[PDB]
Amino acid sequence: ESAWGPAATIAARQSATGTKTDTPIQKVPQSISVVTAEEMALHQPKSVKEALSYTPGVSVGTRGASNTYDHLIIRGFAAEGQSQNNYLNGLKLQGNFYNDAVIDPYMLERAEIMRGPVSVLYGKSSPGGLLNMVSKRPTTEPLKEVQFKAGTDSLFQTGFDFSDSLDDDGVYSYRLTGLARSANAQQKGSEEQRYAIAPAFTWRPDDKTNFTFLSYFQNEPETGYYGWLPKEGTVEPLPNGKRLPTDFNEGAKNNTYSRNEKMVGYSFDHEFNDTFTVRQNLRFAENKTSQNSVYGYGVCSDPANAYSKQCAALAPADKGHYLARKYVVDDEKLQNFSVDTQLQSKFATGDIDHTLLTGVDFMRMRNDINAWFGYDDSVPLLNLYNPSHHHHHHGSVNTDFDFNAKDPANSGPYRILNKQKQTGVYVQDQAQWDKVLVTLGGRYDWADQESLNRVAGTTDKRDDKQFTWRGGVNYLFDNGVTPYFSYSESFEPSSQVGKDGNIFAPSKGKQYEVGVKYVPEDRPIVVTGAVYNLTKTNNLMADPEGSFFSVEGGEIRARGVEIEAKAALSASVNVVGSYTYTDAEYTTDTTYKGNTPAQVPKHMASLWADYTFFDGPLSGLTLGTGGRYTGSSYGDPANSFKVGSYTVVDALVRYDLARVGMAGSNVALHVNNLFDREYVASCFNTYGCFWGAERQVVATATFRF
Ligand SMILES: N[C@H]1[C@@H](OP(=O)(O)O)O[C@H](CO[C@H]2O[C@H](CO[C@]3(C(=O)O)C[C@@H](O[C@]4(C(=O)O)C[C@@H](O)[C@@H](O)[C@@H]([C@H](O)CO)O4)[C@@H](O[C@H]4O[C@H]([C@@H](O)CO)[C@@H](O)[C@H](O[C@@H]5O[C@H]([C@H](O)CO)[C@@H](OP(=O)(O)O)[C@H](O[C@H]6O[C@H](CO[C@H]7O[C@H](CO)[C@H](O)[C@H](O)[C@H]7O)[C@@H](O)[C@H](O[C@H]7O[C@H](CO)[C@H](O)[C@H](O)[C@H]7O)[C@H]6O)[C@@H]5O)[C@@H]4O)[C@@H]([C@H](O)CO)O3)[C@@H](OP(=O)(O)O)[C@H](O)[C@H]2N)[C@@H](O)[C@@H]1O
Ligand code: NI
């Protein structure tokens, strides 16, 4: 089983995104989860976000039903500025502002999640958090697949996945994966549209050389809902004791949101001899996104709208059932070039087998932003009373808004040019002294940035030089158990400027982790467990003397326990489950402190199992079901209020189409939120809450020719 290819069973024993070298999970000093393509082919996830609903240490409701971005919170932390922190084939998909890219899960072979500091091999990064997806590569045997989806809210999807060789030797092979998806968003008025295709070409001149061309082109006319809803009407009852239905939409009838993505690159490797292997991963991308968006701020009585006139012009008791709103017109375009070159030296030193990795990583990202942001009273208010029982028979779109002619009073232009560059040199060794595998290594990064404000004519720049290393040990037993512990570090530059008109210094990550991994060589089952102590130092916090500007020195701690399990308990039984304990807390902070950051539940857990029949008349029938538990979380930094826990159930019914001459093909039915439970996924503040996803039914027919 290769770290860059299929896994056979839902259990992947190999992963290269933790050490940059194909290594069995048990031999990796860090918490690494691997969602197989098979698993994704089980719930037909809408996004890579979803494909992670069962993996521990990851929240996936930081936006509820919305799918605009695969923005994740890992171990209580996320990248600064609501930015993603997602990697594709070992090279980061560096985005900026509203320009973050997403890859459709159908084009993936596997989605992996690295928990904890990751700079020792990838450079600047949020603490305890990294996602790396592996593009599908040409297959060893021919593959001709056609897929058809049909579901709730007018879900219609058609896609293909073909892979064959040009020559009988396989020196030349290709793979073309594409799809077209259209659907109505949960919220009335909003649509979801996606067209994508991934051309891939592999050239193996011999059994020691592999150059694989990887491209992805995707166009999304409409990405759907991305607004905020007040805790008043969702988490908490509105004055009239009623609530906004889960399909409510407080955006302009003419709200639009699109994104365009284009990337070309390659993954290369060559084995020179018995001790040296070289591998280079390169990708270049140009992505765009534009939008006309009216989003909700909170209700007119929300501290946020204190300085709002339209609000102050309402009877003191009515300020609590009227919704304040703002808007934003955006248009961005960025280019991202990335290349990682690495030499793998394999040699010994008397019983000490070494696996030395030495390489340099480079990336440059440029993102030009030209947008307009409406401030207070920038857009009409909305009454929240009408949303009663007759809605709940629901939706009811609203009215257009003049995104054009931006009043210089209520709105202002925002035009910035962000540049980013990072160069890293890392050295790592994987020395195994029989049953005693010791991993250790470090990296030095040159993190340079520069931002131009096309209006203030300002140009902020900062060049960070940072070092990070990681050390760990794995006692590879033989019965399978692989106890381990490791120390890791990460660093994350700031783009914010202090009162002294200067970019702040980077924040850092320090994690202490110990755990045990069970990867028994016989049965196809993997069971990991770990407890950790992660620390983010020099976080930004409110200036002690309140000055609009922020001050550094802040600190946050996140300690918890994570256990996950995936297995093939039978030729017909599969199971996946995990539990997560997350204790995140502001160690040092001006305003908050002792408070837990919003959107990070203390408890999370999931369990899923499927059975398949080969027996009687029910031969070729798979039935599966599972549940995901999200504990309560805080809906704001002040911890003013709380978002209640919830549990959602998923079900699956699959039927092998062999009994009609079509072996390998099948028809399936997937249900998400079986009991159509209504829940607020989370809130990042009193005015920003997100309804969870309502029950969704999808019918899939996937044929293999
Ligand atoms: N490494 C890497 C990096 O480097 P670094 O340094 O960074 O590190 O990077 C790089 C880059 O590349 C990339 O990019 C691209 C794009 O780019 C662009 C384009 O578009 O192209 C450009 C840019 O800029 C620049 C740079 O580079 O930066 C600079 C300048 O100066 C120049 O040089 C340019 C070119 O070369 C030329 O063209 O480049 C940018 O842009 C923007 O910004 C800028 C600044 O700020 C920067 O800093 C400014 O300047 C500009 O401008 C403006 O524009 C506008 C438009 O429209 C757009 O929007 C306009 O306005 P209006 O009002 O008009 O509308 C304008 O424009 C126009 O005009 C002009 C002028 O005109 C006049 O004058 C002149 C004289 O002086 C002329 O000549 C005449 O006479 C008159 O008329 C012009 O110039 C323009 O253009 C033109 O050009 C040519 C000539 O030469 C021709 O003609 C053509 O046809 C045309 O076009 C016009 O248009 C104004 O001006 C702006 O604002 C960018 C942005 O940022 C975005 O991104 O852009 C890319 O491509 P694409 O396509 O894809 O995009 C690529 O890919 C990449 N790579 C690199 O190279 C390296 O490698
Ligand atoms: Ni340059």
Side-chain angles (χ1 to χ4, degrees), residues 150-173:
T152 310
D153 304 298
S154 299
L155 167 54
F156 288 106
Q157 186 178 300
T158 177
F160 61 99
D161 189 2
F162 308 139
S163 190
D164 222 343
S165 295
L166 299 173
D167 68 293
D168 305 313
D169 285 293
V171 56
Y172 300 114
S173 52

Side-chain angles (χ1 to χ4, degrees), residues 370-427:
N370 178 202
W372 201 285
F373 288 76
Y375 313 123
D376 288 314
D377 311 297
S378 61
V379 47
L381 295 193
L382 267 175
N383 193 308
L384 283 47
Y385 191 89
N386 225 151
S388 69
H389 177 86
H390 180 62
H391 293 165
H392 295 255
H393 252 219
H394 64 265
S396 288
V397 59
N398 302 349
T399 62
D400 298 320
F401 168 93
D402 176 52
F403 285 106
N404 283 292
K406 14 281 176 58
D407 190 318
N410 54 234
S411 63
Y414 185 63
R415 299 194 301 129
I416 309 278
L417 180 73
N418 286 151
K419 287 192 174 182
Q420 277 180 42
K421 285 197 172 193
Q422 170 157 281
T423 291
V425 289
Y426 50 102
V427 178

Side-chain angles (χ1 to χ4, degrees), residues 315-359:
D318 288 31
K319 294 172 178 292
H321 80 87
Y322 269 101
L323 179 60
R325 295 143 84 211
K326 297 179 176 168
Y327 76 86
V328 63
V329 181
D330 179 60
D331 190 296
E332 297 169 58
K333 173 185 75 171
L334 77 60
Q335 26 273 163
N336 193 187
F337 180 78
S338 312
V339 288
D340 186 28
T341 300
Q342 43 189 81
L343 168 55
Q344 175 176 286
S345 303
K346 304 291 294 299
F347 58 65
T349 290
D351 287 301
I352 313 175
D353 289 307
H354 291 196
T355 312
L356 173 69
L357 182 68
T358 56

